[PDB]
Amino acid sequence: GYSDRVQQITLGNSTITTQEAANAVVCYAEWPEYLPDVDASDVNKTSKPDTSVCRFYTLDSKTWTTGSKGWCWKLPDALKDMGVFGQNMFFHSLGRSGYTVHVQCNATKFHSGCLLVVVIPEHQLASHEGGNVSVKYTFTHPGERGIDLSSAADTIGPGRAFYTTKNNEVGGPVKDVIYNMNGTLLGNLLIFPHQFINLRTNNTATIVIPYINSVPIDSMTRHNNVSLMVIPIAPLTVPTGATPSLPITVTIAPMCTEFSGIRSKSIVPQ
Amino acid sequence: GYSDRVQQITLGNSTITTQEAANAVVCYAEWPEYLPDVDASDVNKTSKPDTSVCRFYTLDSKTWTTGSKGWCWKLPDALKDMGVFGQNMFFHSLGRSGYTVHVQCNATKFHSGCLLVVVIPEHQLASHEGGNVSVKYTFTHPGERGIDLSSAADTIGPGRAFYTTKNNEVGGPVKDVIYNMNGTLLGNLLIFPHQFINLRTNNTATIVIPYINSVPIDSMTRHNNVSLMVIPIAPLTVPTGATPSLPITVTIAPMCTEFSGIRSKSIVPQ
Amino acid sequence: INYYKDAASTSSAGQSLSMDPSKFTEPVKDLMLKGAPALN
Amino acid sequence: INYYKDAASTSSAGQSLSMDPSKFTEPVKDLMLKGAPALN
Amino acid sequence: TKDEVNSYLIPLNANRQNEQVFGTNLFIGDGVFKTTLLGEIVQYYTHWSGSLRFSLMYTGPALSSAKLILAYTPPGARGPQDRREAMLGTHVVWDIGLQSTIVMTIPWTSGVQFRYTDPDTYTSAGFLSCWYQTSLILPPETTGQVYLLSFISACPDFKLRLMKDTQTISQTVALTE
Amino acid sequence: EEVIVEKTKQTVASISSGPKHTQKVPILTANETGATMPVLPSDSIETRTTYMHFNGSETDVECFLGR
Amino acid sequence: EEVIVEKTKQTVASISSGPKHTQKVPILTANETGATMPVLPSDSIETRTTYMHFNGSETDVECFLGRAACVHVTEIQNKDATGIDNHREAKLFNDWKINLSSLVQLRKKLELFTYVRFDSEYTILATASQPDSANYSSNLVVQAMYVPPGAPNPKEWDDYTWQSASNPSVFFKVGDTSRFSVPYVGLASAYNCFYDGYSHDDAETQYGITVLNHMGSMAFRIVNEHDEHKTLVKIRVYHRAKHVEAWIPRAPRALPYTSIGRTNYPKNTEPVIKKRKGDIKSY
Ligand SMILES: CCCCCCCCCCCCC/C=C/[C@@H](O)[C@@H](N)CO
Numbered sequence A, B: 001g002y003s004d005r006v007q008q009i010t011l012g013n014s015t016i017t018t019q020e021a022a023n024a025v026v027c028y029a030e031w032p033e034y035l036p037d038v039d040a041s042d043v044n045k046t047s048k049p050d051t052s053v054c055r056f057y058t059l060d061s062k063t064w065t066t067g068s069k070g071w072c073w074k075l076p077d078a079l080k081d082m083g084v085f086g087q088n089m090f091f092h093s094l095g096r097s098g099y100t101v102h103v104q105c106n107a108t109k110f111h112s113g114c115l116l117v118v119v120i121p122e123h124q125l126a127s128h129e130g131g132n133v134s135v136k137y138t139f140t141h142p143g144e145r146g147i148d149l150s151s152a153a154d155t156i157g158p159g160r161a162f163y164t165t166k167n168n169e170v171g172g173p174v175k176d177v178i179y180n181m182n183g184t185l186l187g188n189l190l191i192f193p194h195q196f197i198n199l200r201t202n203n204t205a206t207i208v209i210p211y212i213n214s215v216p217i218d219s220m221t222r223h224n225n226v227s228l229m230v231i232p233i234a235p236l237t238v239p240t241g242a243t244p245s246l247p248i249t250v251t252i253a254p255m256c257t258e259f260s261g262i263r264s265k266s267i268v269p270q
Numbered sequence C, D: 001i002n003y004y005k006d007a008a009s010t011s012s013a014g015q016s017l018s019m020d021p022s023k024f025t026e027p028v029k030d031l032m033l034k035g036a037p038a039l040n
Numbered sequence E: 001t002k003d004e005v006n007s008y009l010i011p012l013n014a015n016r017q018n019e020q021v022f023g024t025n026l027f028i029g030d031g032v033f034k035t036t037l038l039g040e041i042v043q044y045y046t047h048w049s050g051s052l053r054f055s056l057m058y059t060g061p062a063l064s065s066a067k068l069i070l071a072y073t074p075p076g077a078r079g080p081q082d083r084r085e086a087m088l089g090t091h092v093v094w095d096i097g098l099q100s101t102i103v104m105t106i107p108w109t110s111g112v113q114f115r116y117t118d119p120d121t122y123t124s125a126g127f128l129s130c131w132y133q134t135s136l137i138l139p140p141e142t143t144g145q146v147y148l149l150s151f152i153s154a155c156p157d158f159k160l161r162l163m164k165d166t167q168t169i170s171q172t173v174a175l176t177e
Numbered sequence F: 001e002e003v004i005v006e007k008t009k010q011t012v013a014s015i016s017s018g019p020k021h022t023q024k025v026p027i028l029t030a031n032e033t034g035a036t037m038p039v040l041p042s043d044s045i046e047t048r049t050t051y052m053h054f055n056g057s058e059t060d061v062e063c064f065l066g067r
Numbered sequence G: 001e002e003v004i005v006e007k008t009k010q011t012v013a014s015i016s017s018g019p020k021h022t023q024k025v026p027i028l029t030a031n032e033t034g035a036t037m038p039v040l041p042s043d044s045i046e047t048r049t050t051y052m053h054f055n056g057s058e059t060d061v062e063c064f065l066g067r068a069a070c071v072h073v074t075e076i077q078n079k080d081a082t083g084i085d086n087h088r089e090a091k092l093f094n095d096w097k098i099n100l101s102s103l104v105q106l107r108k109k110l111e112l113f114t115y116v117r118f119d120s121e122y123t124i125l126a127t128a129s130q131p132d133s134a135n136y137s138s139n140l141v142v143q144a145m146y147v148p149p150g151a152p153n154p155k156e157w158d159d160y161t162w163q164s165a166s167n168p169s170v171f172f173k174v175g176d177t178s179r180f181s182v183p184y185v186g187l188a189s190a191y192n193c194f195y196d197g198y199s200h201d202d203a204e205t206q207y208g209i210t211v212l213n214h215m216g217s218m219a220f221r222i223v224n225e226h227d228e229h230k231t232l233v234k235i236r237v238y239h240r241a242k243h244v245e246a247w248i249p250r251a252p253r254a255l256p257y258t259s260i261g262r263t264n265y266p267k268n269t270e271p272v273i274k275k276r277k278g279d280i281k282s283y
Helices: A083-091 A186-191 B083-091 B186-191 E037-042 E083-087 G104-110
Strands: A007-011 A014-018 A062-065 A071-075 A092-104 A114-121 A194-198 A204-209 A226-232 A245-262 B007-011 B014-018 B062-065 B071-075 B092-104 B114-121 B194-198 B204-209 B226-232 B245-262 E009-012 E020-025 E045-049 E052-058 E067-073 E090-095 E101-106 E127-132 E146-154 E159-163 F012-014 F020-022 G012-014 G069-078 G093-097 G113-129 G141-147 G169-173 G177-182 G198-200 G205-207 G217-222 G231-249
Touching (some): A007 A092, A071 A245, A083 A245, A083 B083, A092 A114, A092 A226, A114 A186, A114 A204, A186 A226, A194 A204, B007 B092, B083 B245, B092 B226, B092 E090, B114 B186, B194 B204, E037 E045, E037 E146, E052 E067, E067 E083, E067 E101, E090 E101, G069 G104, G069 G217, G113 G169, G141 G231, G169 G177, G217 G231
Parallel strands (some): B014 E090
Antiparallel strands (some): A092 A204, A092 A245, A114 A194, A114 A226, B007 B014, B007 F020, B071 B226, B092 B204, B114 B194, E009 E146, E020 E127, E045 E159, E052 E101, E067 E090, E067 E127, G069 G231, G093 G217, G113 G177, G141 G169, G141 G217, G198 G205
């Protein structure tokens, strides 16, 4: 009867449906949960909005062409302007959350291509200028549009639409895909929670992320706990006559969200 | 030991202290509470932010002069731009809440004056043009600044600073204090939950308001459940040499707040 | 046996013996059995 | 265990565990309760 | 320009509405705290944690009145520029009366469970500010400024770690008889 | 914020304290008495439960003057 | 290849497995799920029974990060202090901003994980030499003082700061060695090897693990006064982790490092993957 390909996820007033899934990854076999008293430090009663923030938010879609190199989003940064979650993020000095990420990309049984969907905890990026330069806030907190690696990649060496937000401007991150933007190799990214969207097999990837950090709760605007990466390993191959592109959509839903230290809105650069 | 003059109210991360109180009124002897299943209609799981919204918010202070006629605030309108409460108000189509209102005004044992602090449920205002004219949204939803009755009053007949927001402009409410802006008499306002700030006795008034409505939950941007009114009955009399004015401060705290029907931000006139 | 007041002074802790790779090798939601078809 | 005749030779004494700030924070004659009015 | 008793006196002006009374960041190892008993002992340690006790005592005439709002602003947003901004964080509305002192608490609000005592750090516990909630009203035959006295102490939850030398004492030559 | 609980011989740093509306006002006092009232955060804001996980051994006078 | 059998408390490496012809196919799977099925040799070939005779103790994180590694090499001098306006630039004393990222060997091992919690065992070795004219070699004593953040920094080699009334310090002979333990001293529950966050000073924006790495410094000096000759003293600091706990394994470093704290690599760097002499079919 039931299969691992057909799944339904319901969070708040939103529901995700999939008929071509490949099971679902729960990071380190840990489901998200609220902060227990035994691990708490901050004495303030936390705020748990529940269904008003723990729901699915769909980001802007991306276009996967043969020249694509990859995309990168940072959480909770990617959701900073998303409904009540974003608002709570700016009014509180502290917060913690888990997530359920859902990456979508459908095609036909004539298409070829493979996407690596990986979640990297504490993904500290390298600077484009190299040596002893630090990445400026703007580039390290790109928002819902994320970072397009195709602006200056490693694999075939291209410069798609940009080089960065405007162009190669002081403080941008090194966009070499093969080096994971941090001096390690792409092939080893599999040590982190991941799934593949192999067009011949599945059309979605689902990863549930618990709160991962060395502190019980943390500043949400100054720290990005995880980084979501979508990278084309096997290039996109469309059938004869078809458009050489395919859309990719990302939908994220915060889970077990807690907020603390409420004051006025946060002052961030840009 | 303890007295009715000294009280402390703690909501969320805010605390109110008073040493010159006159007990506290709990509207119709009913403390605020969450909506029980037996009275519910809307099937959506409601969101209860708790401490992030159920806290004290202080509005802009008013100046009580000898020519003052009164002030009027509408809830939840008065808190529409207040922190996380305001945000939730705009993102949800439904919501319900109780309140604890705290009106402040200190002087010396040489001063005279008396303020009536009253909470009026469903305070439907009358139009300035009279006859068959309706009050325009802007004037009926004044925000945290409230409505100054001294712009065109009943008692001694003055025109303090304005006539309305800009001036007597099509759609303004009739500002006759003696007629409660609705064709009834001021002296009968005591049938509604109230307290007096008699300068010789007390310097604060406290009223706790439960959710009052004929529906279990309602639209917060299109409906004002209660109206808070501060009216000088016995005029302000300052001692020889002193400034003929006194500040009045209003602090309101939402209680047992629930939100439902979350979508994008509401579109309201102005 | 006992001549140090602080625990940081002691030597190595020794082997854990509780090494389970599951959380890394099989962090999937639905139980995947070896031998059964990966996706039904 | 025991190789010194004088007590001055031994190491540190260790924590007291009986730390009560009362004699410094509340050295008042009449009992002052938190919550009750400081002066009646 | 020099150390004086006036350094401890917070001025309070009559008949002013929304204005600020005072403000300060919460670097307990520097600023106005450096020379207090708490600040002095805290400087002998590298890490700190716990809640602070901030007290305010009114010293004006018995026949005067006032209402102030004390606010604690956690880090992330700068110091409050107006009462509306301050009122959004942790605060206490103080009514001056028979009981002369208000004891506001600065609750431990932090993600990491310990903070550095070092003032040369990027961020502290946050900000502290005081505003006229109503205004100071002086009785007849009285004029001028009245003063507030501020106090600081640690709550029972306070923690201190890693002993270090303090930068509040030094010498160039050994002292002689 | 009281001092004793059963689990692991743990001392509580702060107790769970909700909204208040009382005539018992712990945050008002008189410093002219020369006393410092033991006011905790649960006396002025809503708090959750936390544990000390700390004995305060490094601030003992033995350690302070013991190097 | 299951894990338990009775004889000698022996774990079996492989079980006896014969021919197969089934509908249960363990060697077929779907890697898109993100899982690695525990396929053993008995799932694809006929196997005999063998025992492990192995516990895997040397690969325990305690052992892996549990040996001393050089984390710093500094240099101080003993010479005439007269006329010198900067004792630190003259090397009469020197301070080391404590971190385990300066020397690459240990750095790469630590960076295999995201969070690590452990106690530290330090060993400091001091050696001397006299590059110029000397009639003899002098015995010297070195003082290593820990200056936590917030504590006054030494400005001169004979400052008042060297009294070390509260700062912990060690005194030992040059040619000899120093050793002490340090309990886990992080503010958080574990140290961060990486940090995807920044800080604000109203002046400059700092990004990365540098934001959290705010340990103190180690000030070194020769206690003795000067002799007729100049003495060069090299100081080597070694670190050994004890009672180790590690979290979130990572992709190992592939490219050379450029600076402390940053994950930057040099531009115009050589390829890290070996290129074949022949083609993809070569052996
Ligand atoms: C007598 C002198 C006493 C000196 C005691 C202070 C030494 C402090 C030792 C802490 C060691 C640094 C721990 C941080 C490790 C991280 O750098 C790595 N996980 C990442 O590279």
